[PDB]
Amino acid sequence: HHEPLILTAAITGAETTRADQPNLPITPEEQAKEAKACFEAGARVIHLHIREDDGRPSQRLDRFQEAISAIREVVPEIIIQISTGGAVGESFDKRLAPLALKPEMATLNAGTLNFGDDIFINHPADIIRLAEAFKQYNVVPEVEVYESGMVDAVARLIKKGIITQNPLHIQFVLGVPGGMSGKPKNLMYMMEHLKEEIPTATWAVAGIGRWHIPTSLIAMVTGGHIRCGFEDNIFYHKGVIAESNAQLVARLARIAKEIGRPLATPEQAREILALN
Amino acid sequence: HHEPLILTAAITGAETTRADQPNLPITPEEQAKEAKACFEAGARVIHLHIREDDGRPSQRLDRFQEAISAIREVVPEIIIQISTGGAVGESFDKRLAPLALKPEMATLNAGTLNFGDDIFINHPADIIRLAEAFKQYNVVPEVEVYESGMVDAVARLIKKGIITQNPLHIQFVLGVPGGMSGKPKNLMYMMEHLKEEIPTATWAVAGIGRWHIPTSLIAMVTGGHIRCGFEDNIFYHKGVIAESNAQLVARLARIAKEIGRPLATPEQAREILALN
Amino acid sequence: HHEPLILTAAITGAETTRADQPNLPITPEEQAKEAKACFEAGARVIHLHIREDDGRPSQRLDRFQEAISAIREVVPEIIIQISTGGAVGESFDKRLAPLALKPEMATLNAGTLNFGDDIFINHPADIIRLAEAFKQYNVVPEVEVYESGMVDAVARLIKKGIITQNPLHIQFVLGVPGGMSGKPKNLMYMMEHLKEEIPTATWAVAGIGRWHIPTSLIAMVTGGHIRCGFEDNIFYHKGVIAESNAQLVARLARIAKEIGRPLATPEQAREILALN
Amino acid sequence: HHEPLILTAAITGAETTRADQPNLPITPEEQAKEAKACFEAGARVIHLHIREDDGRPSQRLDRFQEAISAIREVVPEIIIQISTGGAVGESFDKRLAPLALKPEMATLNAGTLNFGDDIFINHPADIIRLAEAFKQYNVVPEVEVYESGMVDAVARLIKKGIITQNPLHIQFVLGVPGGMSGKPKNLMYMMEHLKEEIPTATWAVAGIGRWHIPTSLIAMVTGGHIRCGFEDNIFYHKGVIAESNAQLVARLARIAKEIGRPLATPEQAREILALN
Ligand SMILES: [Mg+2]
Ligand SMILES: [Mg+2]
Ligand SMILES: [Mg+2]
Ligand SMILES: [Mg+2]
Ligand SMILES: [Zn+2]
Ligand SMILES: [Zn+2]
Ligand SMILES: [Zn+2]
Ligand SMILES: [Zn+2]
């Protein structure tokens, strides 16, 4: 718990509505304002989904460029990580295309799983073509794993030379209905499983909904990094809607200050994530 | 390791070929002969997939009835458990239909996962309609779980009253490329996770390929039950093709005898699995 | 994590020196002042060792009565838990005798271990006669466990009817040089091992030195209770001396408030610990 | 699980009686006969305690030399590992002295624990002087661990350069009343904890009494080595006395042959244990 802590803010996502979370940033300007407040509260990475002005999820490259430019202009030092997951059911071609904008980092979903009432599909041949696109556009991946078997699947892609990023950054996404939950036994199992299978990988955790607090506090004291935000959780407390993404980031920064864990500077975040 | 041991023989499966495993039983008569040898070697359950005479996987109800009748006639006491998984890619309607034959037991796959180069699809709405069909035809399920999150998903179906079977029998299917592996850390994690989430559930393990021996020896001494067979593993030793499914069953029976774990009688197997 | 949190303050101990920790309470008056400040900061239990005015550890019943009375006079709501461990090397007769003062609670050390440069001795026959004295004097024990095997040893005393207290309160004491450390894998293992062996037991954790923060944050989100204080840790941060025991308690209360875990009232602490 | 398996036979011990186990070897001639039968059954190490002709435990160097010479004369290939634990209650000077006989290997008990009705004492200063005697006499240690905290204590002696043996061989001694039990969760925890704290250490497990089978089957498939014998367990099955130590060794050799795990040759056992 003395190693620097990287906080990611997943500020928008594909499914959160403005009716449930009135402070949900939808436009590039709203997303830039939120990103500045999150950076000042301690966030070093923004996990970015884009929306049309009507709130529907978007995959348009011009809209992604608009949001990336707006965020970059308010906080040049923040790391802008784009989502290649998008909205469940979106075509894989549309999910892959924004890598052509050459972001510093982007997500790489490592498997298929039932996801609420639907299926989040990542066909093995599509995972390989996405992994190949990361190499061609020189984008560093954040590999998203929702279950134990996805760690093994990623290890096999490393062994075959399909994923060559080293060190590799994994994010455990815990709490999806259909995926592994965020209970402490599970996060401890996952970090130890990852250490066995991909020994040099670094990791972060996203705890959906009620799992935000248990995943965050374990990650605090096990060297992991943490994601928070409206994409994953709109509540500050049970039954109490959050005021902003920055409010969620600031609580994690306050707990890190209480326990003496320093927040990573932008330079340290880029060094840990091998973005230089 | 003093509790009775139930051995399941998965004798055929959907993908194993006769060229790789010349002793693969394909016809109902061949499957009955294998089932008798497996029963005499210690198996109390047969996990049944059917094939056409040309070796292609089948879902025909008349072919399922032919195989069930042939096995029943050689060993009336064996438990015949039919597969509702079938061949990856088969239509869900064809996978569900054989429950109408009212077998004593059948498999119920609890989630979707990448499975080798393809996806084994179990849409959440199809899992619910299959669970409903088990109730209507008074069939006891064996719930197949390939990942941690599938245990939580099954617990939510129990909470909603969609799965009412109690005690419920779970089988951990470990070693699929895309699913959780069969390493000892994983089987220990899964039995403890299941005890937390579905405390009265019983369990078995199927260790695909190289995971057959590690899963079997852990299950031996943790009270679990074991599945073996050509569907999951065609080798008796690394690089040494097995002579029969009964050879694989007999090794497990010999190890159980060495350590003093009794094999379940047919009556004990039916009592543990709540088939009476 | 809405379950009430009981904070224990171990304010003095037997070995801490005022040379290392200038604000260590030594006398009954100093201990009463600290106990009131700890109670106001959120502590519901004081774990009490006594000292002579010169700072030497004491086992005298008149001195224990002086300290108990001084604390009760200024903060009657707090639970005063006396130590039967005392200073390593103390005679077992002197360690047992203060149970005759009929405190609400007292510690019951469940095994022997190397403890720094010495041995903390708890002979099996002495553990049994101490367990019998808890029954004789109607005192509730807090059972101190430093290793996995002490949980099994306590389970055997329960089976034999030597310990009949139900529910039983266990405290994991982690970080002793010679005992189990406070790394997160260990505290997760211990709570799970205790759930298997003594399913109805409640638990707390004391994290010695550098293990204070990792044990506290894991206990926060797993339903455990927490001990802090100069007996276990004199530092607020690595290389930063704590200002008082109440400063350590207040940090835990602030983290609990951040995450929405309520602090137990005195009535709830007595109900959970079965002190009524 | 193709890694060679080293079997140790702990043939006599200090406490086993011929009244409970009529075929217990007591004299040097009896111990030599048993050692040859154990070697032929697959054992590569003899863990040696000596007795007087009346069955009383001994620490005499002339009696140790008699037993070592008798075993070497009939089976020179076996590794003779002497006990420095001896009978609980024995003086530390008498326990250390036989290292002057310059055996190939000897045990090094890494902590104190309650042991049945007594205490097995290993004062921290005595552990250090024993570690120094291993260097003085050029003997390789087998470090005996009964609890998690003993692994940390050994790691601290390595850090201080008190133990310089590399690779270090640890034996987990599980099932002592007072020590960690041999349940599968515990052996999995211990091998993983040892991998975190002493990454290059090799390990074996001794499962006392009823824990012999669960520890052996887990070690079989996790790369560990196994100890068996009358010192730890006199029963072949629950309520079935073992016929000899070689009968216990032969069962482990049969299970290893069933699963395809080779037994170490004497040369491989000396290479793995760094005895050349
Ligand atoms: Mg949708
Ligand atoms: Mg706002
Ligand atoms: Mg196919
Ligand atoms: Mg044949
Ligand atoms: Zn996303
Ligand atoms: Zn099948
Ligand atoms: Zn104390
Ligand atoms: Zn011994």
From Swiss-Prot, chains A, B, C, D:
Q: Does the keyword Metal-binding apply?
A: yes
Query: What reaction does this enzyme carry out catalytically?
Result: (5S)-5-amino-3-oxohexanoate + acetyl-CoA = (3S)-3-aminobutanoyl-CoA + acetoacetate
UniProt effect for mutating S83G? Reduced catalytic efficiency
Q: Where does (5S)-5-amino-3-oxohexanoate bind?
A: E15, S83, G86, T107, N109
Q: What InterPro entries does the database record attribute to this sequence?
A: Aldolase_TIM (IPR013785), BKACE (IPR008567)
Q: What does this protein do?
A: Involved in the anaerobic fermentation of lysine. Catalyzes the reversible reaction between 3-keto-5-aminohexanoate (KAH) and acetyl-CoA to form 3-aminobutyryl-CoA and acetoacetate. The reaction involves the deprotonation of KAH, the nucleophilic addition onto acetyl-CoA and the intramolecular transfer of the CoA moiety.
Family membership:
Belongs to the BKACE family. Kce subfamily.
- Show the Gene3D superfamilies listed in the entry: Aldolase class I
Subunit description:
Homotetramer.
Molecular-function annotations in GO: 3-keto-5-aminohexanoate cleavage activity; metal ion binding
Which Pfam family is one of those matched by this entry?
BKACE
What general EC class does the enzyme of this chain belong to? transferase
Q: Which gene encodes it?
A: kce
Q: Quick one: a GO biological-process term for this protein?
A: L-lysine catabolic process to acetate
EC number(s)? 2.3.1.247
**Part of which pathway?**
Amino-acid degradation; L-lysine degradation via acetate pathway
Q: Does the keyword Manganese apply?
A: no
Q: Tell me which residues bind Zn(2+).
A: H47, H49, E231
Cofactor(s) listed:
Zn(2+)
What is this protein identified as?
Answer: 3-keto-5-aminohexanoate cleavage enzyme
**Keyword vocabulary terms for this entry:** Metal-binding, Transferase, Zinc
